[PDB]
């Protein structure tokens, strides 16, 4: 009766939260040289209800150029991880997206730059003491810089909403977290080249290289699951729902013409990110007339100029996302059609360079079956 | 007990309209003008359902034509691009009628931080002031031209989840009216020694400063596709019959070491109070005040506090201090309501009182349109 | 029996009724200006009225560096060390909080979710900012200069504005409360180069000739007035008012490199949060002297065994920044440490390097019954 089942799921959820034992433990650590390999498979533990994975990444970058330096790109350390893919025990894929998109969602969900240290007038020495997410603004010719990055790969939606979580007990569990890290070919961009996927860009890029990269994965899950008269108490709707992040690329933009990216049906899109990679140039709204979301049945529900669009985002993350990165929150009322494309994301560009494209990022809920 | 019946129903209807209707925000009007020609505009919004509020974008290009002197932002700066804002619902009933700076301070108070500001952090990823949503050059040098961007949210509804104060705009031949009085070459620039209260820039070059142009764009936020029940549209009749307004006033007659009391009228439920101590054109960081308070006829004093402790209370509210001479008081959980707590007043016992000292009061309150 | 669940519901309702019917009040209790060289310990006598929730203590000071050439600079804790210790006793003379100024301040911060009463920096052109200098102190005081400081502390009884657990009913005349404050003096506030800066406010080569010109405080008492009275009398949340919410701190020594240092939770208490300061022989490091930290139970638990940076990450989610160097925080608010719920539990720190006189200063925040 729907109402019945949901009432049941929410109760089981609260019981699990009340009774279960929350755990966060290291699953794997490794150090390597991107020259030899940059793709890895992490095999998590199959215990209780898995909520997500915290991925710590550290790296040492050396600028072996004789005289030219390099400087952080807009995404910087967020590109330490190129991509991520998660397969659950039943071999069903959840998240499959880029590291930068995953990072922007982590920020969006936190309500501020993910794991950042806010600046205040406090005389007591709070501040960037621990360099949790950190990277030198520039790496001079001959210097070696150290970076630290953190990503949260979510299964469950949040700490108190287990929608998307994974019950890990399935024997012959095909559960695996795949990570592709940056390498000497993706991390550094030459002057004039596209900085989208790079970590550093500058005149000394050609001679920049990784001294090494290291990662540590922590798995977060709930143990000591509650058991009722009928057995283990579990929110069946939560555990049978997928909460994923995915990315896609779109091209074919033309000045002053509405570029529309349709949302697929069945998916409940919680948020949308659109990056205007204007042929390797990323501008602060100046190459756009407006953005919007619209149902080709009731016009636009939010056709806004770039700054006003940015204003809404400032209400969500207390600052702006990097240049050319646009965010759209639909958490309270997810974009959910039924007919592929009853709703679309719109960008009417003011100027379009050669090789322009929109790099899309989505956050959504969907049923396993 | 009929009241307990009405409220319960109003709440239910609110929940239903929120769940059933879909949020919409669309541009209603945009214009570029020279404030030398005109500065007052009457914007006619569309009557398309339940209106929650208006987001007003304002931009401007200001040139300092002075041969040698510069000008610097006043404490309120771009918040003074709009001098006054007045809203009239379809029934020509007035809701908000306040100054741009007061409206802006309330936007800040409601957000829990400087309105639409970009917080500074240690993040290496390039977040930050990328889009300059609310922006203005700290100074405008002689011969230079500066650009500014400002935003104001004119509320009807109290919030996104509490439709108290929202307006049902569906009355044909009787639309709403959003009156905007903008800054001009007379109000925006204060000479050295002049009162900067309403100015944007002040300095030795003020006399030669002028707007090149000002532009504004009004966005209307409303709820469309209202839910219709077994008996017509289901609506929270109490929310829609309540006025949520911002208003301001001025008070004079302060004496050193004597309690200056400003009575709160009766019938109104005051959610917040702002008091600006315009000390004869001087705005001080609490040093010209002995203490502030909110007291009842019983000479109680539920909040008699020294300036810094009062400010501490505000820091818990918006994570920082309001500009110099601006004092905030939050009464959102237990609104000041005389005749249900007795007569109440806002108190300021000044330490120093210059010539032409006055207290500019800003109020945020609820009241029945009947 | 379900008699407890019934008692809890009844308590909660009384709390709701009290929060809705009574009116919150904050009023000055007393102000005093003095030279810590003359006196530094004060017993404040709060007024007995309604339900007391806590005290906001404002502290200001003027410090003069009279060295001939050397200046001094704020230590990591700085003005948080203006008050060395705070102790509260209710009307029945039952002791509640008893802790250092720095621990209390760090808890104030944790509860706020940001540096206590700080002013956040933003790009806003409107002149918001550090206007009123609520908590403030000059980064340095040059030789011959005089600096001014302002500090605030919230001494809680009640857990929060909405949770009256730990509050105090003060309607017993001839039975006064007691708020003892021990302030910093010329001995505790200044640390010489190389000395331990833990409890100091300023440290530097000019420390020997630094002295307070004066210190001043103002205690404000926060309470609920006009308590609701019903058929059977005053409606009161009996469990809230008979529960103690306290902060305390202790020191622990005996750390060895690469060996797990375990501080057992001498429970029976419901530990809401834990702060561990790694005073590594007078030097405070940004996690570089620690292999990992964690909380573990009887078994081989390790509910959260983490390297320093990841441990710091959890805290960044809590207070939007890091606590000062060598200060580690652990939030257990939703599921308090209670060793009777899962055997003994301990806070663990496996040090990478241990200097001479190394120790862990533990700060606890907890609930406990006036009668257990």
From Swiss-Prot, chain A:
It comes from the Viruses. Keywords: Capsid protein, Virion. It holds the Pfam family Phage_Capsid_P3. The keyword Transcription regulation does not apply. Its main location: virion. It is found in: Virion. GO terms for cellular component: viral capsid. InterPro entries: Phage_PRD1_P3, Phage_PRD1_P3_N, Viral_coat, VP_dsDNA_II. Major capsid protein self-assembles to form an icosahedral capsid with a pseudo T=25 symmetry, about 66 nm in diameter, and consisting of 240 capsid proteins trimers. The capsid encapsulates an inner membrane and the genomic dsDNA genome. The major coat protein P3 and two assembly factors (P10 and P17) are needed during the assembly of the virus particle inside the host cell, when the capsid protein multimers are capable of enclosing the host-derived membrane, containing the virus-encoded membrane-associated proteins. Homotrimer. This is Major capsid protein P3. It comes from Enterobacteria phage PRD1. The gene is III.
